[PDB]
Design a binder for this molecule. Structure first.
Ligand SMILES: Nc1ccccc1NC(=O)c1ccc(-c2cn(CS(=O)(=O)c3ccccc3)nn2)cc1
Ligand SMILES: Nc1ccccc1NC(=O)c1ccc(-c2cn(CS(=O)(=O)c3ccccc3)nn2)cc1
Ligand SMILES: Nc1ccccc1NC(=O)c1ccc(-c2cn(CS(=O)(=O)c3ccccc3)nn2)cc1
Ligand SMILES: [Ca+2]
Ligand SMILES: [Ca+2]
Ligand SMILES: [Ca+2]
Ligand SMILES: [Ca+2]
Ligand SMILES: [Ca+2]
Ligand SMILES: [Ca+2]
Ligand SMILES: [Zn+2]
Ligand SMILES: [Zn+2]
Ligand SMILES: [Zn+2]
Lengths: 369, 367, 367
């Protein structure tokens, strides 16, 4: 039926600033929140403020040295850390900014708090739009991400759940999550992403995991221009077969919005309804679900996408006409919730999508039963 | 009248799936012997098919799957347990002696038939050892290992812009539908039992994708359909398909597991009700490849396909079976035609009309 | 195993002839990525070509023409309108950015391969960016600007008294036949479509001049030739040529515009049928330089030259294509091999034998 949803938000998150010209804008999390307050979605969910996750929590995955660096580095001492910055890949895509460590603590705190709540069966669904930072690695930042809140939340779920399914609909390959779990069968990672001379460079469909994890990493490589009909025709079949073969008892869905049409950095052509169909599909399996944010660089569309996906999580129909809100002028010139696709060419032919699907289905046959 | 080429290899009846397995290639040899005894050989050209090569099979199936089919043997299965799981071979699709050659003969007949139609050397080609519609690019399924129908249609597509595939086996022809699901050059039309039944696919809503949207047609049925209910949906559907799609060749899979008293099927058709489909298709005067399919009550398979060959040849044959090498199998009546059972028809009139009207709406979406 | 070295520059795919122009250097990059993903890099030496210098190019081409190619740019075309006319650049051989560098890289691979063959460092050298057989001493023609084949053959003739050139592009190899038409130190053998077709040369009766009389061989064909027909004349012609001429090196231009389905060509060869020519030439165990050539359905050019690279390596590769950077270009079937079309073969069996007999009469006139 309808589920209990817990939602995490820190009202300070929107003030963190990556720097002039940097495309990652934590302000999109505050726009999302303001928009769903204005639709009245707060009546229907429990809103919690995340704690600041500690270094003890983050070193359940990341190295002590890397977490100590992240605690220590500031724009005023950068000059003393030129060597460490290189080692940990901080200082260009992943800049040093004021309050960097606190931003990581809040992003991480909502994901891990949501995993706790799920483990305690206090909620069916937990939402943390500030999370989803899937590129961070054990000892290095990558792709605007510093601490892998998803890996930490999955580790928390693995205390109570034998098998956890991770699904990643960000336009980029979820490489930090896949690498963390690449040799285990206790997390199956499934990433749909643009592949071919695109960041981060990994996620070929021939990357299937290794050792006990062989067959428990699933990658669906796509080309530019994918649209709702192409996506919707492979996502429900793949996720259904994964559910059937792997039988997870919890699910983590990264809902990166850089896969929408009109994204400043992404090259796909999904609408908000197309993207949100993935949430609807995953919800039908009725498993404990942690939904997380991710990329997304055209901020008016990020706010629309994550507002509508919160409404889907709540089984709540919201009108297309946007309510007035603090960021109303960002949504012009139409002031509607739903977006139109562009006329960009879809380089993903229907035969290509069916062929890749058939190749992954072969691999899913190799799971035990 | 019309010319009929017919394919049969005298070895096909010797392949054996294993003790207890319901698929019996010997039904093909029974069929052939009954038809020879009716004198239907005087009226058609009978050819022994060449064995399809492994290379011909890889026009559709994956190389690793075909190499596996060529390599696996009852005595070596312990070296191939991972590949058996990958390719779904070993249970319902067992490893048996000569498996690969059985696939070469069944495929050979279908492909040879398609070549004869492309060359305009015949009007109709018949391969009762064909019709193995469940096989997939890289997996066996439902007693089928190599999809001879797909390979024959790929061959027709060299010479025909649009090919229509019609499937009256009781099961959804899923391997054929999947092969062509994103093209408009092949329209697949399957009538089948649907609902907690193998293979699980063939929903009314599965209508194709991409350029193939509206070019896959499924008529899902419940248990107990009879000659009258089936014939009142088959003719109008196929007539409207012929009208809207205008194919230049037709492939008809005539799986006989939709007959009353089938060991595995739950339909209530007679031989006449099943063969009415062949008659309807012939009225459109298009190049036609007729293939076999399922059928597990082997005496009724031999009657069905004998009667359908006679329909192909426009020959009325007597209800009294001629003497033949299998005569005792047809006792105690020794008649060609069978009676339906008293099983209940669970397809209500409302149900049938609702499905037919949806399919007509889908057919109106064609250009 | 015979050793194979293969030339490829990663920038070659970025040269662009302009919107709507059928020649697409990107096909070279597609071919490269397919054979990487088949694993064939493990079996061969892969080199980056040098940029051939003006000094190298003027071993054949006029100084004036090379100086013009090294000067001409989209931004200065206005000032070179008379030279564009003189050198035939600006229409079917357009000016584009990097033109000269593209010529340098295509030529660099063929001349470098010939050097490797002369030094007995390899048995076969492959440059799929080469084969630009229409360029003339002082003019561009037919999308070709620098005749890398003529330059490679001049390098071979430093070490080899007699070099055989074989051209299976659908077009007559006119720039190469012209360069060598009055010498017996190169025999040129071209199979091509002839009759109101580019470049208009290559009649059966063009057999060379002077000391080169009888050292040019032309087999003119009509539309629709297929694998069966082509392979029945290629092997006996080449075998007789090898017997009578006894070359010590061979250059084989493998233009893929002779394939079925080519955007500009009218033949009906499959990848197997085209690649059989490579297998035949290899049976003579002579140093061999294999070069590219035309080909305008770029998915089938990548298939052809990938399979011919495998044939050079004595490697069978599966029909199922591996995943690769351009995998969507190979739908709908995603197989390596292609089917022929239903086009009529206008080359009758008597036509092929009669022309074969006429050529065999000329070959008997050799010492
Ligand atoms: N995926 C994702 C999820 C959650 C938080 C951040 C992300 N990071 C990205 O979206 C991203 C976009 C671009 C680039 C890049 C680098 N050089 N060129 N492009 C790198 C990363
Ligand atoms: N359709 C068809 C055509 C041509 C050749 C073989 C076939 N295969 C069948 O007839 C068939 C019947 C039953 C079952 C089954 C599986 N689990 N329970 N029943 C699977 C398949
Ligand atoms: N043969 C070849 C080899 C290597 C590189 C390019 C080539 N050039 C061609 O294939 C070619 C095709 C068509 C035309 C043409 C001109 N007017 N109409 N058609 C001219 C040339
Ligand atoms: Ca992804
Ligand atoms: Ca894993
Ligand atoms: Ca059926
Ligand atoms: Ca179809
Ligand atoms: Ca030629
Ligand atoms: Ca000569
Ligand atoms: Zn992203
Ligand atoms: Zn069946
Ligand atoms: Zn050419």
């Amino acid at each position: 039926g309808k589920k209990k949803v817990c939602y995490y938000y820190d009202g300070d998150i929107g003030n963190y600033y990556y720097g002039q010209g940097h495309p990652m804008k934590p302000h999109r999390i505050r726009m999302t929140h303001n928009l769903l307050l204005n639709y009245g979605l707060y009546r229907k969910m429990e809103i919690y403020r995340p704690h600041k996750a500690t270094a003890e929590e983050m070193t359940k995955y990341h190295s002590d040295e890397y977490i100590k660096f992240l605690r220590s580095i500031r724009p005023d001492n950068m000059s003393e850390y030129s060597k460490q910055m290189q080692r940990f890949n901080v200082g260009e895509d992943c800049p040093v900014f004021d309050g960097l460590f606190e931003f990581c603590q809040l992003s991480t705190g909502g994901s891990v708090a949501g995993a706790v709540k799920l483990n305690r069966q206090q909620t069916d669904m937990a939402v943390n739009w500030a999370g989803g930072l899937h590129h961070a690695k054990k000892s290095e930042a990558s792709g605007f991400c510093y601490v892998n809140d998803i890996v930490l939340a999955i580790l928390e779920l693995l205390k109570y759940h034998q098998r956890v399914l991770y699904i990643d609909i960000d336009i980029h390959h979820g490489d930090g999550v896949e690498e963390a779990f690449y040799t285990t069968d206790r997390v199956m990672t499934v990433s749909f992403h643009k592949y071919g001379e695109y960041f981060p460079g990994t996620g070929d469909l021939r990357d299937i995991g290794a050792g006990k994890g062989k067959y428990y990493a699933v990658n669906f490589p796509m080309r530019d221009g994918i649209d709702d009909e192409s996506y919707g025709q492979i996502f429900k079949p793949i996720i259904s077969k994964v559910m059937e073969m792997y039988q997870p008892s919890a699910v983590v869905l990264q809902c990166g919005a850089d896969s929408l049409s009109g994204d400043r950095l992404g090259c796909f052509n999904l609408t908000v309804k197309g993207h949100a169909k993935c949430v609807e599909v995953v919800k039908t399996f009725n498993l404990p679900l942690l939904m997380l944010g991710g990329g997304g660089y055209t901020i008016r569309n990020v706010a629309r996408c994550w507002t509508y996906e919160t409404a889907v999580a709540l089984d709540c129909e919201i009108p297309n006409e946007l309510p007035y809100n603090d960021y109303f002028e960002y949504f012009g010139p139409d002031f509607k919730l739903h977006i139109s696709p562009s006329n960009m060419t879809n380089q993903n032919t229907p035969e290509y999508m069916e062929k890749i699907k058939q190749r992954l289905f072969e691999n899913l046959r190799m799971l035990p039963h």
